[PDB]
Structures are given as C-alpha cells and as structure tokens.
Amino acid sequence: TSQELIGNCIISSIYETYFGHLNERERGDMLVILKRLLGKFAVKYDVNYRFIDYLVTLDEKMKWLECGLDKNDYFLENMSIVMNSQDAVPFLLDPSSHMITVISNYYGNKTVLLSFLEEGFVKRLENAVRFGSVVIIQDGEFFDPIISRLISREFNHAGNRVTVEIGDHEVDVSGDFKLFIHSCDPSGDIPIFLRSRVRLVHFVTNKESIETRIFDITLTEENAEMQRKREDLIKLNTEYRLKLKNLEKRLLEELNNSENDELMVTLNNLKKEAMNIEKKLSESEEFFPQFDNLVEEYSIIGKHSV
Amino acid sequence: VLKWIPRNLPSCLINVESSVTSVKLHPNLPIVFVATDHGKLYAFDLFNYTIPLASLQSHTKAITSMDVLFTNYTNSSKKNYLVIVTASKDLQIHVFKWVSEECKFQQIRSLLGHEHIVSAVKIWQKNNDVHIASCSRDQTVKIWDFHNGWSLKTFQPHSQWVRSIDVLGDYIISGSHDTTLRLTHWPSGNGLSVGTGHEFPIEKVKFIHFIEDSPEIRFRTPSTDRYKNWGMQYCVSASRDRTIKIWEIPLPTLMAHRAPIPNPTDSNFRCVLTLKGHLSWVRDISIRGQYLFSCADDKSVRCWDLNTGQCLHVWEKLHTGFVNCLDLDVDFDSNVTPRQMMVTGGLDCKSNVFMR
Amino acid sequence: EVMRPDIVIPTIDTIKHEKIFYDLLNSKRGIILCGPPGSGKTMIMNNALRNSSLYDVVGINFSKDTTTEHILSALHRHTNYVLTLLPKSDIKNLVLFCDEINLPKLDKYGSQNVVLFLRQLMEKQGFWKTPENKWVTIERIHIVGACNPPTDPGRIPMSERFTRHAAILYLGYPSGKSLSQIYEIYYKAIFKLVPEFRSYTEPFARASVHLYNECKARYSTGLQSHYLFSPRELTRLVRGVYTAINTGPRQTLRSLIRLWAYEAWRIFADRLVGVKEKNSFEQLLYETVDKYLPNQDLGNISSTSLLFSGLLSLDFKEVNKTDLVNFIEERFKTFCDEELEVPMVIHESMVDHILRIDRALKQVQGHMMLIGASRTGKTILTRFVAWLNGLKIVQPKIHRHSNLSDFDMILKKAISDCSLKESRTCLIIDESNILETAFLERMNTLLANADIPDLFQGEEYDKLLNNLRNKTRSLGLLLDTEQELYDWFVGEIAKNLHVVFTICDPTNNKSSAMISSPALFNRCIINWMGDWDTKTMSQVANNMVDVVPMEFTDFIVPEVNKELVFTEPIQTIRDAVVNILIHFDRNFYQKMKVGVNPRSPGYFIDGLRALVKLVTA
C-alpha cells in the first residue's frame, strides 16, 4: 500500500481541479484514460480506488448527508470537491439552489446570505470579512469586479496581519473567513477572469444522472434489505477497525514498566477483534459479486429510461 | 595614514548559513558581527573566523539594520560596554549588551511602537545621554532614550515610507521611498528642507562630518562662519537610480536660543555632485578620509573620491550575488580610533573582510 | 532625426504624387486618398502640404462620434468672418484635412451627417449657419480625405453623392526598389553612428525589405485577423535598431546581426500564434541571413537565444541567461516583499516576455497589447516591469454599475497626474474594463491623438489652461499663447503616458472589435502570450514539485516513444509526475473540444498545488 500512494495522490488531486465541471459519463471516460495513462508511465495506482472512500470519511459523509445533501454519490463527491478548497474560492452552480440550506446547516448561524444585486453589498461584505464570518453569495452571473482582490487572493502580509484592498480603502481580514458563490443560471454567461480562478462545480442533473438515479431507486426498492446490509456491514467494518486500533493502543499502553490480568484480557480482546475482522472480510468478499450481478441486471431499465 | 586603500584581494572569508544583511565592526577589538536573513545574529573574530564567537536567535523574521556604539560615561560606576541594537521585520527591535570577559550577548530591552517593519536604526550620544533612533514602514521616525526606554517624538517626514536615517547633533536626515529626502529638527520636529532630484527610492543616507586637519578637501571643510557655527556642511545620499549624490544643507531662519524655521526662499536642497557608473542599485555608502566607498547590486564595490569625483578603484565579482552592506570606523570622533580595515557582506551567504 | 515622425525619403512615387496633388488642389477639386492602412497616405499628405508655401494644414481626426462642432472649431482657429468666410492667411489657401472618413457612423436611418456637410461645403460652396440662419460663402478652402477601402470589418461604405464631387486616388504599396532605396537612406543615417560598418548599409536594407516581403506573403489574414503587415513595421524596426545602437556598447558585426535579429523577432514574429508559424519564421530568418550576409560565427538566433536587456548594465547589450534569471529572481523577491505577494515561478518564457515588455515600455510613446489566456501572468508582469522602471500603476477599478462618467474622471485624474505633477504612469486596461464601445472610442481618441479634448471643455478648459500656465511659469518658460501650452501639454502626455492592454479571450466579439480597431492596432505592439508550450509547463512543474520528497519507491524506466515525453528524458519519478500531469492536461483539453480557443493553464497550477498538499499530508 506504500508502493502505490503516489499514484493514488495524483488521481485524487487531479480529481479536485479538472473534474469540477464534468458529468458522470465524461468523468468515467477521463478517469479511464487517466488510469491507462498511469499504466503507460509505470506508476502504480489502486485498481479498487474510490474517491469518496479515499477522501470522504464516514463521519464527514454522514455530517453532509444530515445537512440536506442528496444520497447520490455524484453530489457527495461534488460536496467533497467544493469543501476541500483551502486556496481557491469555490463556485457553486445549482439551478435548484438546494444546498444554500446545506451549507447553512454545516456552518450553523455563521452563514450570512448576500447578493451581488444588493446596494449595501460592499459595506456588509467588508464587515463580514472583518469579523471573518463565512459569506454566501447569490447571482454570480452578474459578478462585480470590485472583489477582484478577494477572488485571486492578492493579499499582502503587512506586519503580522494579512490585508486586502477592497473598493477604494484598506480593509482587514481574518483567518476564519471563507467565501462561496452561488448561481442559479446554468447557461448564464460568466467572465473568463472569474471562471479561470474559481472551481466551477456543476450541481445539475443530466440523462446520465437519470440513469444513476433510476438504478438507485431500483436498488432501494426492489432489494432494499441487501443495500441495508451493505450499509450496515460498511459501518460495522469501520467501527471494528477503529475498535481494533483502540485495542492495539491499549495493548501498547499496557507495556507499563513504571503478563498481568489486564494485559492478558487486552490480548484476548485483540484476538477476538482480529478474528471478527477476518470473518467480516471473508463474508464481505462474497458480497460485491452480488452488486456486480445487480448492475449487470438493472441496466436495461436505465437504457429504456434514458 | 588616513589615505589607506584596501588591496585587490580579500584578507579573509566568512561563511554564513543564510544571506548577509548587515556587517559591523567592534570599535575597540577585532570582532565582526554578521547579520542574517533567518534572524540569526553571529559574532566572528578577524583572526579566528572558522567558528563563531556567539550565535543567537532574537527575531522571528529577517533583520535589516544594525548599529554599534561604545559609551563614554563620565562616571566610573557606569563602565564602558558595547551596545548592539538589531532591527528586524518582526515589528520589534532588540538591544544587546556585549561582555568582554564571557564574550556572549545579553538582551537589555526591546522597544515597541511601530505599526510596520522597521528598516534602519542609529545610535548616538550628545552629552552623557544615549538615544536610539529608528524609522519604519509606517512613516513614523521614532526616537527612544536608552535608560527610560520610552518614545520622545513621533512624526512623519514623508507620505511614503521612510527607509534609512542618520543622526548628528539635534538634526536627523531621512531617506524615503518617495524619491525625496527631508531633514528634520530633532527636538521640535519641523522639516528644515526637502531634497529632490532622484528618480528612484533612496537606499541609504549618512551625514558628511568635518575633519580637523587635511591638505585640501572640497567636500568636508567648512565654507563660511555660519556653517562653521552650525556644525554641518554637506550630506550624501544614495538611491536605486544607480547614482550617489552629495547635497548641501540649506540655511534655515535660525535664531539664538530658539527652534530653527525653514526659509521660504531657501528651503530646497541643491544637487552639488553626482556619480555614475554603477550597474545596478547602490545599496550602502561609507565615507572615510577623502574616499567615498559604496556597494551595489552589480556584484561589486567601488571607491570614489570626494575632490576629483571619479572611481579610483573598482572590485568586480566580489561575491556571487548582490553586495548588501559596508561599514568602516568613525574618523570624525577622537574617541573612536580610525584603524584600517574594511568589511563587506553579500547576498550569496558569504562575507569578506579587508585587512592591510 | 529618425525618431521624429515628420520625415520622408523622396523617391519617384512620392514626388509624382506630390506633383499630381498640387495639380488637383489647384484645380478647385476635392481629393480623396484611398489605400491600404500602411501606404502612408497621411505621411505623404503632411509631407506635401507642410513643405508647401501655397497651402496650410488644419488638423481634424474623424471618429465614430463626431459632429460639425469639431469642424467649426478647427476652421475658427484659422479663418475669419467678413457673409463670407476667408482664411487668416491672405496668400495660402486653407486645405481641410479629413482622415478616416469611413469612421463616422450612420444615423438611425442609414445616412451620415459630416460627409453631407462636407459635400455641401465643396459643391454648394458654403453652408447655412444654425443659430443666425445666414448663408456662408467660401472661396479658397479645399477639402482632402484619407480613408481605407470599405472591405475591412469596421469601415462604413460611403454614399456616391459625396464622392461625386471629389477626385479619387489610390496609393499602392511601394515596390521593392523604392523601399530598398528608402531604407538604404535610413540605414546610412543610422550607421553614421558606427562608421566601422558603413559598407553594410545595402545588405541590411535588402534583408529588411525581403524579410518583410516574405513575412507578408506567408502569413495572410486567413490564418489570423491581426496579420496586417505594412511598411510601418519596417519603419518601427528602424526606430528600434536606432534606440538599441544609440544606447549600446562598442559594436561588432556579429553583435550587429544579433541585434537586428532580436529586433526582427520582437517586431515581426511577436504577433504570430502557432508553433509551426514561429518555426517557419525562424527558417525564414536563417535563410535571409544566409542569403544576404555570408557571415560565420553566428549562433542560435531563436527567441530564447537572443536576450537583450538594459537592466543588467548601463547600456543595451546581450546578457547571459543564468545571470539574467538570477537577477530577475532576486528583483522579483524584493518586489514581492515591497508589493503584493504572489507565488510566481521563474521560467525562460516569462523572462523573454518581461524583457520584451521592458523594451516596449522604455520607448517614447510606447504602447503594447497583450493577447493570451487567463492566469498566464499578464497584469502581474506589467506591474512588475513598471515597478522596475519607476512607473506608476493606475489600475481602473470599474464595477458593474458604472458608466462613462467615472471612467472620464479616472482618465482625467491620470492625465492631470501625468502632466501637472510630472509623474510617469503605466496605465493598464483589462478586457472586462471596457463595458460599452464608448470606452473603446475614448481609447481611440486617446491613442490616435495625443490627448482627449472632450475631457476639457468650458470651465474645465479654462482651469486646465490656468494650471498649465502656472506649471510653465513655475518651470520658467516663456510661453503665453494657448497653442504652445496645448502642444507642450500633449507632448508631456505623449512622453510620460504608456497604456498596456490585457486581453483574455481574443475570440470574443468585443475582443475582435478591440483588436480590429485601426487607431489601436497600428500604434500598439501586438504580443501573443498564448498558452504555455510543453517545455514551459515542464519547467514550472519541475520547479514546483521538487520541494516535497517523492523518492521512496523503486521505479523501473518504461520504454516509450520519444514524442510522448515532453520533459527531459525520464530517469526519476518527478519527471514521471510531470509527464503524467502534462499528458492528462493535453488529453483533457483535446477531449473537451475547446477548438482554437486559448487554453488557460490555471488548471495545471491548481492541480500542482493540490498535488503537493495532498502528497505532503
């Protein structure tokens, strides 16, 4: 797993920047050509790689699901591609405008709604960047170039405090400030200056997403117990791995030295947990071919639907 | 003996981990202090340069300027020690005390009040009273006293940020980033005159002091009885326009036992002499005898003359990169012995010293 | 004297045209000069009238927004009223200049106004005064014109009712022999500076004329819309060679040829768009030098092998690449310390472009246009080079809810700072900074002329004249008439103001109209930033990835084709990462059907930053 990490980092980093504004089919095709291209240049990647299972832990995944995001994997990886931008200001493009509520839930009361069409926009914006509150912007198709310094992050380190120039006067910023842009027009013309400096993420629904959602509905209604078993086994496998790691930490802390019953009990618990891990892996090994058969069996319904 | 010229080759070599920003001289014993960019403060001996005498971290950011003074307190209880003040980019300056017996640094006090990075510091003594002057990017030329450690006067000479200052008596000259100079009265704060004529920001400025006896100097001797009574004759400035200009000080509306006032018809500097030939920005200047020494960013240091006004000697390729600072010994004060060495520092993490 | 723009070289064609033009003016007939934009109609026009003792010149420049008030103001400065209108001169008949007659726009009902006014003046021999309703009689005032053919995209065809009364002439491009003689005289004048190479006047004139001929013949307007070559480019080449030689060191023949090749690179091929087109230009330069100059010891004369700078010394001489890169890196670190901080990486192409922008900016009345994709480093490079030369950045902060008013204020403030306060300014204009075509017409007026008279009228004009008189008296110059003050002011503006344009997407209609404008395309130097070639991307990736350790796995060297590897031949894993990223970027841009649109490389920098962060974690 360590002769393999640099291939897995490049497939994940390239997933963040280039795949923002592509749908399911183009993402699949480009991921396939990336895997073939990595194979051409002899860098080992993961044949069983999944972007969500590589970067989206179960805790953040559940926290994002409870906020209001749909259970589709595409929206999950797009929420990941948005929230994992520490350097470039992200662009949110959803005609439904459904995830303003989601980001409000994630950031709590700190979420402050603003719009480019407001007249007191600049004053409350400089106030918000002064206190460092998270800012949500609507109607990005009418981008105002007065925030060009914020968009490209052309700050200057004046002393120990970071400083930006907005409007016609010096203003101060704080490290807890984050900015988001939401738009409602999928075909709204955007300046190339804004487009090339943001992370254009498309929260739209095409025919390929129709096929994916039809397949999801068929799995969650036709055979729902097997999908529930998948979710339960994934959760218990993660919990069992965490408990095994905690038991090993207990064993290593039981070195003592400024054998005993506590150390032997810890070793027996580790033995039971490792046996449980082995049994869970053996049971899960013969469970994914059921998914393969279900995919090969529920594709005509998707083709007819599209 | 005052007409000494360093030879064509460096006497010794000094290696530092990072780039050199300031090189000074101990005015009594052969010890060279070398600044860094990582904030480290070094201490080298001329005859033993392999191993530093002391190494200390006192600033989080880069150190820009240094100053070294030896006190002359009239009382025997206050012994004569060495004070080293280093100004850095960490919004703070630190003051060191050198000890001869233990050969180690000791921080005395740190002076705060700057709103931005400080670029220059100068130390002086008029009559049994040590003062520390500094100028920063916040356009505030601040003055401190050593014993109290409190500010005395804060003022802006220029709208754009000041870079380098020099002190003499009750008068402070200050270069700036708005390609102009302005003298200020130290106690009152009134700008006596404003100099203009450079086409680029000023790097370093120092006064040209008088001399007691010399055959013929046309740029250090007094001109009239008014200037003899005043005590300053010329000032020299260096700026990023590849030139060094020596300027006269205009007369103020001076009155006995009163603050000087600017002359409405004579409150403007006059460019006297200019020197050209440097391939890049002149970075630092130092005057000794009748010879004006200046470094530049052309990997070279040049030796100019006050009287005839051209380069007698040149030293190409002194370093791999830019040459940052030069310093000499004070010749106009009888307390400081004008002994013969030259010290330079480069951006290529190397330093060089000149002996004999 | 080659720097001043009022000079000609008398060949057969220009004297022939001057003779027939005196005949046509003396025949009481209007004259229209129609020809290609580089034929020098204005040049020969001003040469014919300025040297004349029988006619006078009045300066009018038509624009899209032009009314008869400008014509009335211009004629009022040279004529008098007695109802009869007569010129101030009693012997010389006034001749009324009208260049770019196609430039005034049609009304709401398909007609123009100023051309009909001129027609009424030249065939009804007068006009009706508007407020007093009186007839005007005009006796010895003639009308001349200079307009391009209407085939180019932006010229409005003119009604035959006006061209009825005016004679028409075609000023074709001068042939090979005439250009050879003219530039022979130019090179004799320019080589009077270095008498040691006086015998090389003829081969250089032949080489310049021939190279211009083939550069016109190969790259036509079909490939790109801005390949409008003209002898103006050759004249500007002569000016560049002069401004290099006059501020250069002791000169040798090899350095002479290298200097000429560098000027040719920076004036003919900087607007080329294709790599194969640049290779064709390089082959053309090779064969031209070989054909007309059998000289040996001539090294590589590509763009990256010809670096002439004034920063590294006191004169315009060739500099070593490594010393140049080190100096640029240290100066840029100082720039980021003193100014806005941006993690810019140094590569050879950016050094080449920063030097060509520095060459453009040091010229008097020097203006340039930058064409390239976004996030290619254009405005930061312009600010950096302006800080190098001591210029002042005046960046117009234009928002959405803007109009002509605030743009007029920022232009007026920039002009006042340039003239009154005597501070050089490097004005930058982005593509998004031009909302409507009115700002474009304001730029046309600013650049085609030396100033904008519309910004100073009435009380503004009076206070501007008062401030100009105050500045002139403060400087100590005996100037009292308004004409001398105005000419000194426009000279100060033309000497101390440089505009640099930033254009992101040239395929847009607004960008197409902006680069198709005649008063903007000819004066500015066209530079094509374009997209990064493979070598530049490889250099940037090698300079960005090496900060984090990659070597912890055994790597086998894969045998692949030579054309598939863009980095230097692979031996480690960092080169594998560089190759994999460049290959993915190229395949992604090919499979998105971007077409001939510029490919913004900001995706590559973002991918590299995310890569280094993720591999560190």
Ligand SMILES: Nc1ncnc2c1ncn2[C@@H]1O[C@H](COP(=O)(O)OP(=O)(O)O)[C@@H](O)[C@H]1O
């Ligand atoms: N016969 C000639 N003699 C000297 N220079 C010429 C001649 N013909 C053309 N030129 C050059 O060509 C350029 C044409 O520029 P310009 O007069 O602006 O063209 P136009 O009048 O078409 O706008 C001039 O700079 C001039 O130096």
Ligand SMILES: Nc1ncnc2c1ncn2[C@@H]1O[C@H](COP(=O)(O)OP(=O)(O)O)[C@@H](O)[C@H]1O
């Ligand atoms: N090697 C590079 N060359 C050019 N630009 C770069 C490079 N690396 C990063 N950049 C990014 O490009 C931006 C500057 O480009 P800029 O000139 O503003 O583009 P534009 O002219 O389209 O506005 C910087 O914010 C920087 O983050």
Ligand SMILES: [Mg+2]
């Ligand atoms: Mg023309």
